[PDB]
From a paper:
Substitutions of His109 in MsmUdgX with Ser, Gly, Ala, Gln, Cys and Lys showed the loss of its covalent complex formation with DNA but gained canonical UDG activities. However, H109 substitutions by Gln or Lys, showed poor activity. However, to better understand the mechanism of uracil excision by the H109 mutants, we determined their structures along with a pentameric DNA, TTUTT by X-ray crystallography. The DNA backbone could not be modelled into the experimental electron density map in any of the mutant structures that were determined. Nonetheless, all structures revealed the excised uracil and the side chain substitutions at position 109. The structures also revealed invariant interactions of N91 and H178 with uracil. When we arranged the mutants in the order of increasing cavity sizes (left), we noted that the canonical UDG activity of the mutants increased with their increasing cavity sizes to begin with and then with a further increase in the cavity size, the UDG activity declined (right). It suggested that the initial increase in UDG activity (H109K to H109Q to H109G) occurred because of the efficiency with which the water molecule could be localized to make a nucleophilic attack on the C1′ position.
Numbering used by the authors: 2 to 207
The structure:
Amino acid sequence: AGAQDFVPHTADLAELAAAAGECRGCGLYRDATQAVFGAGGRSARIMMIGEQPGDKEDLAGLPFVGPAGRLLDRALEAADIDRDALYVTNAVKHFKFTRAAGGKRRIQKTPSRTEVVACRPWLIAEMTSVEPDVVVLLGATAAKALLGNDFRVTQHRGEVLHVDDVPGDPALVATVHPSSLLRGPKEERESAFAGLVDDLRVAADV
Ligand SMILES: O=c1cc[nH]c(=O)[nH]1
Ligand code: SF4
């Protein structure tokens, strides 16, 4: 099912990342430039999972390099977390997108639950490889990937979760996606930013 047969029997992240470049576990590899695997090392204590690569990531080959990534860097720095000590990845490894006439960017399209479940074997391989103490789930798609399709990020802010079907039983912390913090009225964005820093500090204190 899905990406399972494309995942090699190794925990080496370089070899996992190369294998993901050849994945056909769902249809998203066709239109994307390349797979965008996670970034960071296997000594990382904190793993962070977003939704999917965006336009910039699809061409950089690295996660969280665009506007959402700059906000996240801001939040990490405010939380006194070294981004270089984390392992950062996404629930889905190929950019799902469309373009609109007049657009200044390729527009992300939400992965279906089918695509998320298809790609999840890579996430399981990354978690097995890294053995994080805590997993930060950034946004609804990532959080649902590990916590169930009905899970609501908005109802469990600040909470340390543990689920039995997750390898290694890491602590799980689900928080707002940094893209959500990019727009809205200033006071709303500032309150939301503080809440993201709070959730990152809860994860870091596990
Ligand atoms: O890597 C990235 C970039 C933007 N949004 C995500 O969910 N992940
Ligand atoms: S999104 Fe995931 S499952 Fe689908 S082709 Fe890409 S790596 Fe494979």
